[PDB]
Design a binder for this molecule. Structure first.
Ligand SMILES: [Mg+2]
Ligand SMILES: [Mg+2]
Ligand SMILES: [Mg+2]
Lengths: 270, 274, 267, 269, 268, 272
């Protein structure tokens, strides 16, 4: 990784942004390789304050990626995620699965439509059923396509476990336990009703935001439980009953792309 | 975007202040956009210390914004908030709602007049009743109009969860559970009173300040509960009993313009004069 | 506000000190205003380092302010506090109120005389009774007159919640609940006693310092409670039984101290 | 040592990288030595900001080294672990150990092959048996060879215990207690199934990642206990029955193992 | 005050050292005062980096002061402390008090002699009894005379609550509650014995240092309690039973005390 | 002291290293005194950044010292530790003490031989008994002689408490309680096995090192307790039952160990 034999920070930040590198060690290493055929990368290794620049650069790119994701409307955002979708699947892969899980495409399309706008009480789609019915399967594939984030209720003892809600456009709380559902009930009523929540971030002061769209998976039916009365009118549920087990379903990013490109009209994304 | 290519800090701050951009990412990104037709934004992308300038800009803006909000009296402040609101509105929306909850508007007016002045033991209004009675609805609309902040009891194990009290002119805790009331009872009587309190802020120094007016929504009626005895005298309760939804429509929705109408109409009786 | 447009730091500090502006936001903003008719304020908005100047200014002003407060004897200090108060006032307001609570003013004068000197086991006065008996009312007015600080037990899980004790000449804990009394009993007897106490400051290192005089208000009568046995000796209790609202101003206290100067041993 | 007397930082970093020194103290010391014969090292000692340069050099090196290893394929990584490990080595060492515990070698090779590929349900090999059957012995030896990390699940207090997973190519859970298995059962199905998990770290932001391959050692046979029904298809148990008190597996043993069985572990690059 | 208007750092440090000003706020303020008749203090208010200078000055003075204190043996140190004390004083004040508590002064002298040497298992003296028996009174007067530090168990949840142990020659814990005694029992046996301990300091590296001689006042009799068994051996207890407040030991009293009992306290 | 009226930092570091001053307090003060003769020390006192220079100097020094110390073999190290120990002393007092506790010195020697090489399951020696049996004093004298560190379970809630396992050649946990033994049982297993573990820092670097030979003193007998079964084979226990409750109590010193090590150098397999 030859490191030896006037530096503009702009040019570097640019390069990092273009390549979507946000992480210092990557930025550092990757720019050092570019220096074979890049004058500014060559000038960088001549600098004494490399470590400072690598840091700054990460901070710079982290600022931009974060703030452009926030700036785009939900349609433009989905549009962006469609462009990122490589390979080729089909929206049919998705329909086939719902058919298998005996749920209405139409029900889903509506739910999703309103979930995407983050309309109050329509902001949270639960995917409920016993183990191995492809709940994780579908939800994670959707989050992936969407550029979402997974929240782990394991980390709930720290209140920072919600930090990413100040960032994503969609979020998934995987495998909800009772603990977790009543957590929702206790603390997050406002996330469901589209009122503001103070989300604490680690190295800087907390921010007040509207909680982005939420997915949940669970073995637990909230609508069928009395102790979660508040949740009934705020959580849209879908039950999966059907096994997915061979030593058959794998929704891809292109599957979702086709799904959105094709039902774009029906999802009110115009 | 284009992030690439002498800089004056003040100008960037001027900019950020004008656009009321206070938050680092927005400041950096939004300015990087201004780069196309602003030589200062172009120069910003030429320096090696952009990260720091963004950082300092946010500090500077926050300083100014806080400072100007604290300087204003309640009247002058509400005045500026009225100036900010837009759209079609009427105080009748508010009247209708209180009337729907079988509460005379004057009862609320009397309470609000004192609450706004932050008079001791009158510094806290709680809206209380069964689910879906428009409690969060009303309180949030008001807090929004006032530019107040929401406190999130989910963050209460942190020292800094109260940090906003050093800045806003009104504050809301939405859906106070039993754990929540107890915390308030044990640790926060005098803030509920609107007495001076030491508010700890993250990176900065603790600040001693008059606790701003408080709003609470809750399913728990503190006045009826013997175990919250000591909260009875410092919390004025409004009981919302009537449903504000079937899950067909939601008929009651108060806008900023409704409050603008409200304060303008009732400027006199809320003693917000000279 | 205008934020755009050779800078001298000292002049900015001078300014900040003069106006008693000690906090960064206020300093920054208020100085940016002075910019219309102040070349140094103008020059401040021209520098690319204004962020740290505001920071340093705040630091510098609190250094001075703290240092000048600490330097004054209690008499000299109260003197300056009297100078500061304005408006119409009378110690009678205070007499009336203690009389209303069926307490002779002299009982309070005696206790206060010692409390001000920060005499061990006498460093803490507690105002105790059922709700709405003007406990917080009185204590807060006094703390205000004195320029003392409020302690917020709510922050007690932090290391720095006592940090003001390194600066003020008097402190108040308003509405001590059982949890509050217990914490004090367990951890802070010496603080109550007004003995030297190690006080953790946020970014600076700790200081060993004598703890200022203390005021507490509470519904809990510590004197009557066997489980707060060890607090009985270090806390003088004033029972406020009568309800009410009535108000004590700074000018009332000014009148109070001026009138009772000699009787308070303030030489 | 001499620490007395124009400096180019990159040159130092270059040097440090070459000798694989990621260690402030080591860096500082070694440079100050390589200095009566390096114009730059001399120049370094002339500078007043030496302390800063050492700190930066470390940072810079640990960046490069970390980033260069993160970028390898699993096969390429093992090839690196093979270069890195030297000594008296034979795989005969391991084969007899398996033969002693009555596990067929091929059962293990296969399992490892699919494990190194982090295929879901093939992502977590448990080694199970009563105290003192060389479970730690073997797993530590392997994880060491591979440069993976060791995790201890205490109880509640273990909040950040997974923090290393954010970074290693492989990991070992040392003596899974029953509660540790319940933790998997409750919170880790996604990790085992190939899905992202949020991993909380100390004084930095949480990360989301695919869980590295896991080794577990326990006295608790999860295949037997129905209260862990959901792990049965996700965890592959190797049972160690025989007590051992001599056997000892080394970096050099694993090297020989991997080189010998390379084609059979499907590492073809 | 005036803070407005070539600066030598060393001179400010010299000044600060001379006046024993160790505290940023005091250093800043007190120097800004010296500005009327000191060209260096004037120059200080001309620099734009005065904030850093105040900070570095305190650091610097702290360095020197610490280093001086650490260099001296116990005798030489007490010597310096005696030199510092002023006023009318008599060891008889101390004698009378111990006699009032029905304790022979020699009992205290014997214990104090060893305590001062920081001999293992003898490094901790505890003054114990019902309220208002002059416990805090006495221990505080001594800790003051010695220039020792108070530890505040209130801050024990912090890593640096023991940071002063890297600097002072004697330390006091005033009113040890049950929570206090337990913490000591669990975590600080070695510190009570006066063995080395790793002391965490704010902007500095940890130092391993002999925990200095300890004083404790308390209402709790550790020797009588079975659950504080492991403290019995490392804690010498003086029981103060008789009520007092009048009784008031000054620095000059201690000066008299050490001067009189120099040989008898073995201070060669 | 005098701290008043170009500077070269390397020169200050040279001085500090030679004099082996690694604490800022000392570096600061001592260099200030050396200003009369040495005129770099003079330059130092004329800089406005004196404070930083001290800070950086301490850093720089302790870097070097840590680095030479790791480079040494255990043999060569103990040698330097003997070279460092001063005063009159004898190994007899070590013999006297074990014999007092009814233990053959050779039981101790054997253990120590293996413990110094850091052999798996021999890496930790424990001295276990009722209060007042010479446990702490024996261990401390050894650790002191060895230049090792004393870990404080007080700060255990922050992993940073093991930071010094990165630097020192031997460590002592004085007076282990149940809480502390449980800690070993879950975390420090690998330490008792020769397999490297990850040590953290306040100045976050996050290294991995083989764990130094450990000493523990305790009123708790681990071999007697099942909740500590793992530790049985990995902790070598020396039971001290005889009390020393009767001006200056018994005392082992650096010189006592110095001779102990010079005399028993052979038998301890320290040969090279
Ligand atoms: Mg009150
Ligand atoms: Mg006392
Ligand atoms: Mg012991």
């Amino acid at each position: 990784t030859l490191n030896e034999s006037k530096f503009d920070f702009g040019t570097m930040v640019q390069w990092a942004y273009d390549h979507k590198y946000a992480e210092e060690s990557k930025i550092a290493y990757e720019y050092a390789l570019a220096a074979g055929s890049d004058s500014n990368a060559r000038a960088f290794l001549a600098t004494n304050s490399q470590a400072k620049h690598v840091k700054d650069c990460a901070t710079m790119v982290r600022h931009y990626l974060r703030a452009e994701t926030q700036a785009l409307s939900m349609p433009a955002y989905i549009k962006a995620r469609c462009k990122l979708a490589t390979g080729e699947g089909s929206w049919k892969s998705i329909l086939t699965f719902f058919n298998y899980q005996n749920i209405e495409l139409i029900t889903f399309i509506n739910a999703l439509k309103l979930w995407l706008k983050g309309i109050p009480k329509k902001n949270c789609l639960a995917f409920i059923g016993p183990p191995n019915t492809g709940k994780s399967m579908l939800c994670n594939s959707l989050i992936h396509f969407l550029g979402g984030s997974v929240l782990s209720f394991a980390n709930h003892k720290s209140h920072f476990w919600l930090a990413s809600l100040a960032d994503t456009r969609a979020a998934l709380v995987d495998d909800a336990t009772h603990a977790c559902w009543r957590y929702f009930d206790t603390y997050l009523r406002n996330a469901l009703d589209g009122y503001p929540v103070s989300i604490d971030r680690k190295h800087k002061a907390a921010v007040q935001i509207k909680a982005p769209p939420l997915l949940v998976t669970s073995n637990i039916d909230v609508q069928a439980e009395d102790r979660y009365l508040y949740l009934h009118s705020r959580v849209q549920t879908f039950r999966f009953e059907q096994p997915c087990t061979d030593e058959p379903f794998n929704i891809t990013d292109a599957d979702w792309k086709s799904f959105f490109v094709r039902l774009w009209g029906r999802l009110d994304l115009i």
